[PDB]
Every structure is written in C-alpha cells, then in structure tokens.
C-alpha cells in the first residue's frame, strides 16, 4: 500500500448497515481491460454500534450517527454505497423511508462524499455479495472452477446461503442470479431467511432451560439446565416446522453438491472462543455440538462466567452451538462431519467487496 492510495488508484466507500452495527469500508482498486476492478485492497475500515435501524430517525440522531461512522475517514471525496440489510428489512417501507429521507438530506448538505445509493438490499442481493466477497478472497473468480464453493453468512437478523446451480425455470427468479465476471459466466442459487439470524432466533428460546448453562438465571425465574441435543431439537422446530428450511434447500443441495463450505458472520466469533478446540480455521457441526454440550451446556454458569471474563456473548454459547447445528445439518442437510471453513474474526470480512465487483 502507498501513502494516500486514492491519489494513485480508484477508490469507493461501501457501508454494510447490518442489524447489530454499521461498517464503513474504503477500497482502492485498478481495473482490467473491461473496467472491472482488480487488485482490490481495503485501505480503511470503521465499525460502530448499534445498528442503523435501531436509532430514532430525525435529523439530530442521523447526523450524530453518520458523523460517528464517516468523519475520521482519511478520504471523503469518493462514491458511497450505503446498503442496509436485515435490521431495516424488519421495518415496513413507510418506516424505512423516514431513515433514508434523513440520510439523503444529510449527504446533500455536505460537499465531499458522493452518495451513489442508499437503500435496503434484499436478502437475495446480500447473498450474491456474500458469495462474490468470499470467492474474491479465495482467488476463484479469475478462472472456471473444478470445485463448487458454497457460502453461508450467519448474521444477527437473517442468514444467507448461496452456491452454484444451473438455471432452473421451476425455481423463483428471485432465488437465482447469472453474472459474467472476468470473462466467465456463473449461475448461483441465493436464499436468505429473515428472522433466523442469531439475535432474532434467540428471542424464541430465552426461557428454554436446555439452551443455557446449569443454574444460568432465565428471565422467567427458572434455572438453566443445559443439554445441546435437546436445545438443538427445539431450534429445529423453528427451522423446519415454521420456516420450512429443509424443504426449500435440501432438494437443491443434494442435486448441486458443494465441495467446499465457507462461513462468514457472527459464527466466526463463536468458533474462535477458547472454549472450543478447532484447527486450521475450520469446524464440523458434530464437533461444535459435542463441544458446546460438554464445555458450556453442562457446566455451572457462575464458574463459566468467572472463568471467561472476555467472552461478552458467553451466556448464549450453548444456544448458539445448538442453533448452528440445527440450521446447517437439520435445515440445509449438510453432513455433520463435513468441514465448514470460517474466516478468522479479526479479519472483519463481510459482503462489501461484492459491491465493488458487481456495480
């Protein structure tokens, strides 16, 4: 990297306005013979909490939020894409509109940032960007591939799944995307499940004693009595009896097998805790469930809490181990012993590189 890379390269800002927080990335890039970006490098990032959708939208709060996100960036005179995800999708269009009317007006009132788009993207667009971002990092877009790469984004309010699949005229057009990038034609299945993100999902199980460490104080006054297999079956009832995840995904995956699975999102936070024993930044669902069951569900809450003072979301780790297995194995039909790669969390990798490539 150069000092002041944006005097030497094209630059763009992309903001992931996620359910739990917003992340500003600034990317420098060059472009190949077709004006497609290459050599993408992240030259700045800043993450703030809470989520954009969680603020009261008037001109004071919106100014304070965008100031906190944007003011100390090292360059401002570049195009901005502000793309919100599932936290904004939980709100009706009439309510979302107040947010964007205020945001638009704030960008019109300054003379540096060049707002190109500010809008809520569908879960299907979010899954397209998930797949592009990951495969860009793996260097698999340049040439046609011997192996199928699938991507899962395990977020706070929705989850996405995306994998190669030839065009199928019996599947909704909303769940399929064709793109041509770097001279290759790629066809993907995309799907997002609103409400199955970890924050939303957890609000249906807070009083389940099987989903918390022993003696954890549940909100209703009862005590935790953890057991990950029991917790996992309760979550599977939300996955399949309510959302029909298995009926939608499994017939497609069985016919379009994925050779390598990569996950991003808040799963990498869990998988990186020292309560767990994983090598090579990968896990399997069977090991996750077994280790969550032994190291968390069946331990005494007070002991655990004193022992891991740096795990802020520690109290949910029995529930999350259970949920990820319910989602991936009972929902998507992934084999419990199949390797799932996770990107280390210090990398802060989200779907934003996909916007650089796709616009």
Does 86 engage in binding with ligand UNP (CB under 6 A)? yes
* Residue 7 burial (10 A CB sphere; 0-12, 13-18, 19+): exposed
Q: What is the DSSP letter of 214?
A: B
SS3 string of 267-281?
Answer: HHHHHCCCCCCCCCC
Query: Quick check: bond before 50 cis, omega within 30?
Result: yes
Specify the stretch interacting with ligand UNP by CB under 6 A; choose among 62-70, 85-93, 282-290, 314-322: 85-93
Interacting span for ligand UNP (CB under 6 A) from 74-82, 156-164, 178-186, 324-332 = 156-164
**Binding track over 175-214 against ligand UNP, x by CB under 6 A:** ----------------------x-----------------
Helical H runs in the chain? 59-70, 86-89, 93-108, 123-137, 198-202, 228-236, 245-255, 267-271, 285-292, 301-307, 317-325, 352-358
Q: How far apart are the C-alpha atoms of 196 and 327, rounded to whole Å?
A: 9
Edge-to-edge strands of the sheet including 176-181?
A: 176-181, 184-194, 158-164, 149-154, 260-265, 340-342, 282-283
The pairing of strands 114-120 and 149-154 is unpaired
Can you tell me which of 92, 219, 306, 309 binds Cl ion, judged by CB under 5 A? 219
Q: Which residue reads 């069951």 in tokens?
A: 293
Q: Cβ closer to ligand UNP: 85 or 284?
A: 85
| Structure tokens, 174 | 């909303």
Q: Which window, 25-33, 55-63, 261-269, 275-283, contacts ligand UNP (CB under 6 A)?
A: 261-269
Interaction of residue 155 with ligand UNP, rule CB under 6 A: yes
Parallel, antiparallel or unpaired: strands 79-84 and 37-48:
unpaired
State the binding partner of 50 from a copy of itself, Cl ion, Mg ion, none, CB within 5 to 8 A by kind: a copy of itself
For the chain, first and last CA: distance in Å?
A: 24
Strands 184-194 and 149-154: unpaired
The answer to the question of residue 266 lying near ligand UNP (CB under 6 A) is yes
What is the smallest separation between the CB atom of 4 and a copy of itself, expressed in angstroms? 35
Among 195, 224, 292, 354, the residue binding a copy of itself under the rule CB under 8 A is 195
Residue 99 phi/psi, 5-degree rounding, is -55, -50
Site mask for Cl ion (CB under 5 A), range 261-290, x = bound: ------------------------------
Subset of residues 297 to 336 that bind ligand UNP, contact rule: CB under 6 A: none
Q: Does 240 bind ligand UNP (CB under 6 A)?
A: no
Binding region for Cl ion (CB under 5 A): 122-123, 192, 194, 219-220
Binding region for a copy of itself (CB under 8 A): 50, 54, 56, 89-90, 92-95, 120, 122-124, 157, 172, 174, 192, 194-195, 200, 203-207, 217, 219-222, 234, 237-238, 241-243, 312, 315-316
Binding region for ligand UNP (CB under 6 A): 18-21, 47, 85-87, 155-158, 197, 264-266, 268-269, 343, 345, 347-349
């Amino acid at each position: 990297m150069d000092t002041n890379p944006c005097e030497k390269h094209s630059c763009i800002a992309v903001i992931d306005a996620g359910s739990t927080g917003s992340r500003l990335h600034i990317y420098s890039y060059d472009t190949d013979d077709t004006n497609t970006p290459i050599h993408i490098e992240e030259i700045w990032n800043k993450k703030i909490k809470p989520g954009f959708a969680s603020i009261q939208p008037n001109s004071v709060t919106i100014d304070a939020y965008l100031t906190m996100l944007l003011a100390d960036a090292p360059i401002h005179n570049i195009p901005v894409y502000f793309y919100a995800t599932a936290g904004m999708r939980l709100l009706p269009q009439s309510q979302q509109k107040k947010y964007y009317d205020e945001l638009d007006y704030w960008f019109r009132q300054q003379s540096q940032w060049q707002l190109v788009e500010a809008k809520t993207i569908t879960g299907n667009d979010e899954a397209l960007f998930d797949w592009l971002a990951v495969n860009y990092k793996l260097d698999t877009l340049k040439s046609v591939q011997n192996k199928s790469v699938g991507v899962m984004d395990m977020g706070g309010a929705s989850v996405q799944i995306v994998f190669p699949m030839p065009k199928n005229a019996e599947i909704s057009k909303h769940n399929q995307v064709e793109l041509n990038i770097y001279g290759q034609n790629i066809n993907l299945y995309v799907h997002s499940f609103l409400g199955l993100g970890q924050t939303e999902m957890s609000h249906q199980f807070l009083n389940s004693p099987s989903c918390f460490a022993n003696d954890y104080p549940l909100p209703d006054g009862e005590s935790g009595q953890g057991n990950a297999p029991s917790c996992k079956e309760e979550v599977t009832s939300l996955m399949n009896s309510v959302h029909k995840v298995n009926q939608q995904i499994q017939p497609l995956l069985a016919l379009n097998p994925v050779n390598e699975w990569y996950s991003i999102g808040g799963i990498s936070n869990l998988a990186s805790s020292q309560l767990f024993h994983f090598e090579n930044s990968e896990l399997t669902n069977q090991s996750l469930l077994q280790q969550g069951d032994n190291q968390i569900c069946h331990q005494q809450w007070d002991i655990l809490n004193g022992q891991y003072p740096d795990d802020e979301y520690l109290y949910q780790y029995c529930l999350l181990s259970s949920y990820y297995y319910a989602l991936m194995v009972d929902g998507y039909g992934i084999n419990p012993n199949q390797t799932i790669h996770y990107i280390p969390p210090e990398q802060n990798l989200d779907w934003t590189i996909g916007v650089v490539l796709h616009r």
